[PDB]
Design a protein around this ligand. Structure first.
Ligand SMILES: NC(=O)c1ccc[n+]([C@@H]2O[C@H](COP(=O)([O-])OP(=O)(O)OC[C@H]3O[C@@H](n4cnc5c(N)ncnc54)[C@H](O)[C@@H]3O)[C@@H](O)[C@H]2O)c1
Ligand SMILES: NC(=O)c1ccc[n+]([C@@H]2O[C@H](COP(=O)([O-])OP(=O)(O)OC[C@H]3O[C@@H](n4cnc5c(N)ncnc54)[C@H](O)[C@@H]3O)[C@@H](O)[C@H]2O)c1
Ligand SMILES: NC(=O)c1ccc[n+]([C@@H]2O[C@H](COP(=O)([O-])OP(=O)(O)OC[C@H]3O[C@@H](n4cnc5c(N)ncnc54)[C@H](O)[C@@H]3O)[C@@H](O)[C@H]2O)c1
Ligand SMILES: NC(=O)c1ccc[n+]([C@@H]2O[C@H](COP(=O)([O-])OP(=O)(O)OC[C@H]3O[C@@H](n4cnc5c(N)ncnc54)[C@H](O)[C@@H]3O)[C@@H](O)[C@H]2O)c1
Ligand SMILES: O=C[C@H](O)COP(=O)(O)O
Ligand SMILES: O=C[C@H](O)COP(=O)(O)O
Ligand SMILES: O=C[C@H](O)COP(=O)(O)O
Ligand SMILES: O=C[C@H](O)COP(=O)(O)O
Ligand SMILES: [Mg+2]
Ligand SMILES: [Mg+2]
Lengths: 338, 338, 338, 338
């Protein structure tokens, strides 16, 4: 049985834990977050403004947590090299702080006894990115101890892009993601951390906010065939969770929406089971809260100008979908030998 | 001096009156809305959740309103034919109820003595649509008594699309508008009137909602050279006002974002003054509340995959910009001979 | 097994159905809503913006619904007298349209063969109101075929007010409910139905809105001793569901927050089991989404100025709590003989 | 004519500057904020998600700001003792960081050459609190160099409470402020600064949140006659600005709503001109955006159980009202002799 440690018990951290508690093939044994004592961790696990009450029991046992009868070790270290992952029995670390997105910083977990690290974001350096159901089998345990699970937007775009490119071929494409607000945004107009993303510091609750994203370009790394063929941007909106990819692309081979839907349907029921999904219902964002899929094609929202120029709409719970993929990746990493 | 009568004193109706009160070449003399008495009309004009307190004075005088010391006649007729526009001295009618969008229905205003009618929406029939700064000079007063000012999204897309098509040429394009909520949407999950737009009946405050726009369906009629070359959809978001056009197009002639920006700049400073605008600041939706422009290019938000495949971002206050254009059109109609 | 018909398949109607599907002692056999065809009904049951996906199977069977294998007859009558409740097998009718809140109107269901009617609101006339755990045993089947379940705020206030009046006595009290938005409110500034409530017609998503509450007049009818001793108002806020009672009262006998907490705890574990609840956690509104209790005392939020003047805080899911009580009442009504 | 320096260029900091720009008897000459450079300061002043575009011109002139032709010196010091206020010619410092709320910390501005300091919050120590129109004349320049303008809620509650206590007498009272979100709240579920106030770290956009208010302890210090007779709490809601005081109190002398309204009217037109206001319109929160008053009585929303037990409703723009008062206090302080 694979074991997990979580660094940064935030939106992704807590939902990764929730996903692990639902599974027999992986166990959470340790959590680290210096901005959060044990009682606070219990509170933030028990209660969730988006995903409801924790399904199970959460108690404080001295310095640690007792979750569903299992002991989970709790630490409050600011530096990753201070956390005793090995002694806690944690083989794999979910690096979900948002502040250690390089090999240099994320590899500090290995000093504490960790065997492997998964950065819950695209890296700032050349740490390899893997998307489950797309390129995860490319992972080489002899060459990497620190890997990345990319972004939730990449996890939404890449499986759809693979299906479309395999079947019809993408000549060129531009993506917008209409994305729910995140932790780096602010409740009222203020300065963004580092002063880099000025728009992201504007009142999150009443604004439509343009944003940059490398997600579409990152698909060019996950799927080398699409290097230089895809890019895009983000538009941030006041909703607390769930986002949607809007992909406008030109196809090398003509295809109708129905044919695109069928290609997605066959992948969803076959090689991309549990990763790619589809719907023909009149869905809205809240309908996907808690959805474990990486990408859900919205048939009725797709539009075609002609047989070669199309706009594809795909949903994703940026919190829940991604968290389940990270857990999938951890389980897969363990199966390849630690 | 043109005189205006307003049918449907709603979001557009009330902001059209506000735009008139700012101008010396047009006067509002009559208002009809059967779902609000004079006291209620006074209240809804005085107070606005988006555009602030009315700039001036509003008083009830008997059965009518006194706005900035001027008498404005008030009626409560469900039937357009029953409104005495002529006896009230109203030459042009702003048809902004949302329920009389055909020549057959909108022409009923002519029975009461109105000379011309402007439908505040795209028509359900073949009523001619005009967009200020694009095709408005094509209006023939001897041919048409009922015209349309199209939609707010059309007024955003058409000026930009014309500029791009003229200098670079649009081979093919697809658009999305990330659009603020409107009066037809619902506060909680319920049935949409007529039971047609199921998604639009879902809780507006916490949902990202795919929708229709018919704006590129309208831009093709306003700019015949683009008919069949553009289509689009909408994504409805919880914000109370201000929307954004996201236009992804292939260009006939290669162009950089800088060159595109320069073309928009030249049009904004010349033939499309007051209609097309541009910015290089890190703006968000609230920054455009009250903005009178039809279309504002967001330079920093635009992205290009290559020299001939681009995603262009243009803002619009769907309430304020459109209302100002409708008043512009009414003044223009009056100048052509009533 | 009691059988239920639902008139008005709205927020309350649908959640009443959901509450029944969770139960073995009551079954929904018929639904009536003229503004909603059977396909739309299926859609609105399947998907909920607050309470998630329907847990079960919903299919259209002719003009009727098939839910978890059972046929639920569907009608589209505007006139209650035209609904064949008897032929459908429906014993008790949930009157949840919001427009038939008198004995004269609600008794029309009896013409179609229904035995009993529960109005899902305070009546406009003298139809008796019952609150589970407070006065429901005063119901007399030989006297009344039409009854009321009061309001959600009444169901929150009444159990708490009873506990306080029994143990300590209420000299006088004033309350406010900070209340989530409802169906009667509007997405943008517009006219409310009729002359009623101008404030309620203001943009729901960005306003704090003073309002009225049914519990102001209902509480003194449910607990006659408090008639003239207790009244209040509402403050409407942008949240989609869950509300909170803010009760400020003078006690006839000295009591601390601890003593008040204990009295509530005793009632919650005794005669008001499943109805009155309590918490000592740092809860917020979303933590109560789906909560079945009528009233949950928030210990940490309560404040005492002195030993006889106190502010009590009590949560309630205005949709889920009330819907469960109406079903509780229906089961109780059937147990008394139809 | 006073000169002002601003420490902490946040919501209050920037709106204090905006208030100053509207007046000719006070001038901002310096700003310190280590979390934003001069370009970022210019951006956050120019654009506001609540209060609109800045009325005037904002230019970056090398190191410093040029606002309406006036040079404003810009600093980036974390330590208040390192800011050269004297060299910049700043007489009075607006201490609006939220982190220097003691005499020991706030008096550090005097080291850099400032003459007086106004903390934009209730102090953690015994620094004297003043509310304009309530107790500001008790200020003596020969006694204090460091003072406090209390809080926004204190500035709403105190004038109202004074009027009622002077006219009728408050025996006992409890209040709640339904309060817009602030900078200390979070966009999604997370850990609050420090480690306490867990509820304030919950998703601000979709929650009703019990909270603390500065006015609970401050009101009894500003009006000593009400010490131990008045306290309360806050309820935080998703709106970006504007809050409302809900005051439930018992009176020593019988008084109707009309009599209370007339007493407020007298004060508003007399000793509390520009501080206390009143309305009989069906107002909602957005109607007070930019309102300069400290407290606006909502006549229609007030309720009386009997002639001596009453609930009073008073609005305030927590940003605009308070900011104008701090500027009023700075001007008053200057008039008394620096
Ligand atoms: N939609 C999403 O939220 C989403 C989806 C996919 C990936 N991600 C990525 O996952 C990462 C975290 O995202 P999030 O939304 O959960 O942010 P978050 O703010 O909710 O969680 C971050 C947690 O890290 C903790 N932390 C900060 N410094 C730490 C340290 N030095 N050591 C240990 N813990 C520390 C913080 O206390 C916080 O609880 C980011 O890289 C983000 O880009 C986010
Ligand atoms: N962003 C926008 O809101 C926007 C922008 C451009 C165009 N439009 C179009 O303008 C029209 C109105 O839009 P809105 O947002 O102002 O809607 P609205 O609901 O705010 O206003 C419609 C008004 O019409 C009144 N009305 C209904 N029946 C009437 C009748 N029989 N006679 C007179 N008045 C009647 C209603 O009482 C209401 O006040 C629609 O066609 C809409 O598509 C809207
Ligand atoms: N928090 C709440 O939502 C809440 C809580 C307690 C009680 N209530 C009360 O319950 C009632 C319904 O409230 P709601 O929030 O569900 O409103 P709603 O608008 O969501 O539901 C009302 C339903 O009644 C239907 N309807 C209208 N006329 C009808 C008719 N003639 N015949 C059959 N159906 C008709 C409408 O189509 C709609 O689906 C109201 O009386 C309300 O005061 C509401
Ligand atoms: N409704 C309100 O916002 C409101 C109303 C009345 C009073 N207040 C009080 O006013 C103060 C500021 O509140 P705010 O809402 O403007 O918060 P804010 O976060 O918007 O502003 C605080 C500013 O202080 C700056 N800052 C932090 N450390 C600094 C330092 N060491 N030196 C100089 N600047 C520093 C931050 O960068 C930020 O720009 C708080 O004490 C608050 O309680 C707030
Ligand atoms: O957490 C902030 C990230 O920008 C979210 O992006 P993502 O949803 O693409 O991972
Ligand atoms: O609500 C309607 C829009 O403001 C008008 O534009 P659209 O319908 O073309 O998107
Ligand atoms: O929607 C209204 C409430 O849920 C019902 O209770 P109230 O009317 O007594 O506040
Ligand atoms: O807007 C007000 C500030 O957030 C603090 O005020 P308060 O603590 O007195 O409510
Ligand atoms: Mg991303
Ligand atoms: Mg059942």
């Amino acid at each position: 049985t694979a074991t997990l440690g979580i660094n940064g018990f935030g939106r992704i951290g807590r939902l990764v834990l929730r996903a692990c508690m639902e599974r027999n093939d992986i166990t959470v044994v340790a959590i680290n977050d210096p901005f959060m004592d044990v009682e606070y961790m219990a509170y933030l696990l028990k209660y969730d403004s988006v995903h409801g009450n924790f399904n199970g029991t959460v108690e404080v046992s001295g310095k640690d947590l007792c979750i569903n009868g299992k002991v989970v070790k709790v630490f409050q270290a600011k530096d990753p090299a201070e956390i005793p992952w090995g002694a806690s029995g944690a083989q794999i670390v979910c690096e979900s702080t948002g502040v250690f997105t390089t090999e240099e910083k994320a590899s500090l977990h290995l000093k504490g006894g960790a065997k492997k690290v998964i950065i819950s974001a695209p890296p700032k350096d050349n740490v390899p990115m893997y998307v489950m159901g797309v390129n995860n089998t490319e992972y080489d345990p002899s060459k990497f101890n620190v890997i990345s699970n990319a972004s939730s937007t990449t996890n939404c775009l890449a499986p759809l892009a693979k299906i479309i490119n395999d079947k019809f071929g993408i000549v060129e494409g531009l993506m917008t993601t209409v994305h729910s607000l995140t932790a780096n945004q602010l409740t009222v107009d203020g300065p963004s951390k580092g002063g880099k993303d000025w728009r992201a510091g504007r009142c999150a609750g009443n604004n439509i906010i343009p944003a940059s994203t490398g997600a579409a370009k990152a698909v060019g790394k996950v799927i080398p065939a699409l290097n230089g063929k895809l890019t895009g941007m983000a538009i941030r909106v006041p909703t607390p969770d769930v986002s949607v990819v809007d992909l406008t692309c030109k196809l090398a081979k003509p295809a109708s929406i129905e044919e695109i839907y069928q290609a997605v349907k066959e992948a969803s029921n076959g090689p991309m089971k549990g990763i790619m999904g589809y719907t023909s219902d009149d869905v809205v964002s809240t309908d996907f809260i808690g959805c474990k899929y990486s990408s859900i094609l919205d048939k009725n929202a797709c539009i075609a100008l002609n047989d070669s120029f199309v706009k594809l709409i795909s949903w994703y719970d940026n919190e829940s979908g991604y968290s389940n993929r990270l857990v999938d990746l951890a389980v897969y990493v363990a199966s390849r030998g630690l």
